[PDB]
Nucleic acid binder design. Structure first.
Length: 70
RNA sequence: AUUGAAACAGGGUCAGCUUGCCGUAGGUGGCAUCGCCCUCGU
């Protein structure tokens, strides 16, 4: 259906929270038809240096997911 | 008898481990400072 990415973020202190990708801006969460686009998207996020926020434990984990077509 | 009274952004985390400005290339070739006059006049 609609392929996309699940986003998880681990903070120091056992807590941690979840949100998709594409919730940054006016555009809603972004939708890819093919898993290949999602794989490339994962790669290009993994490419760069990662700048930690405050009270952040380690580099985030992305996993791939297809969401039922909205 | 104040929608008041009490209310830590806290606890730590190397910018690091390294690389030749090198190998050469001319200040040369060459033109007379010359041609000339009193120290006399007692």
């Amino acid at each position: 259906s609609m392929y996309a990415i699940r986003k998880i973020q681990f903070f120091y202190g056992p807590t941690d929270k979840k949100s998709y990708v594409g919730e940054e801006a006016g555009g809603r969460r972004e939708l890819f038809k093919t898993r290949a686009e999602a794989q490339a998207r994962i790669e290009d996020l993994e490419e760069g240096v990662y700048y930690l926020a405050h009270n952040e434990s380690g580099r985030p984990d992305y996993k791939i997911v297809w969401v039922r077509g909205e």
